[PDB]
């Protein structure tokens, strides 16, 4: 199966290739080496999720823009706060398909906004990718109960 870390990272890379000038942030490329990403970002399962997550982003663009901007401008430890936010949604609340998709979409939007802005310090991209990827490991148990990332979107 695919871990949430793999799939989210594949998604950020995939999304990178269909935005901007297509180039890949060093922080992301290094993440693909260190995880190590075995899932291709051109994998059909990544293609589906990428289209879905972008649709969720569009439908909720004002919300995603205001929440992300508020988050990144007031954080003093963005990696820790990724874990804090996740916690509110998924430990102090029950996980659902809805909540999982919103979380993934929000993380992908986060990574796009950071990396499409060349004035963004590397350490910020570094801590943000670190944060969103560890917090997202928390879904593994739940989505495994649900049959995996591949099963969640394709069958139904």
């Amino acid at each position: 199966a695919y871990s949430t870390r793999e799939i989210l990272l594949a998604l950020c890379i995939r999304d990178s290739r269909v935005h901007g000038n297509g180039t890949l942030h060093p922080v992301l490329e290094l993440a693909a080496r260190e995880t190590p990403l075995r899932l291709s970002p051109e994998d059909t399962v990544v293609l589906r999720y990428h289209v879905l997550l972008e649709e969720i982003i569009e439908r909720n663009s004002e919300t995603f823009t205001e929440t992300w901007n508020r988050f990144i401008t007031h954080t003093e430890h963005v990696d820790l706060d990724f874990n804090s936010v996740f916690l509110e949604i998924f430990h102090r609340g029950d996980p659902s398909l809805g909540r999982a998709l919103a979380w993934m979409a929000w993380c992908m939007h986060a990574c796009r906004t950071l990396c499409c802005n060349q004035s963004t310090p590397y350490y910020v991209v570094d801590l943000s990718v670190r944060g969103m990827l560890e917090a997202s490991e928390g879904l593994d148990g739940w989505i495994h109960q649900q049959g995996g990332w591949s099963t969640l979107i394709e069958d139904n």
């Binding site: 969720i56 919300t63 509110e88 398909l97 999982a100 919103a102």
Partner: peptide, 18 residues
Amino acid sequence: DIIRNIARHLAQVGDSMD
């Protein structure tokens, strides 16, 4: 309450999709 609120918005978007 920034983190709590952000998490609430995302909970709502998640819930509006169910």
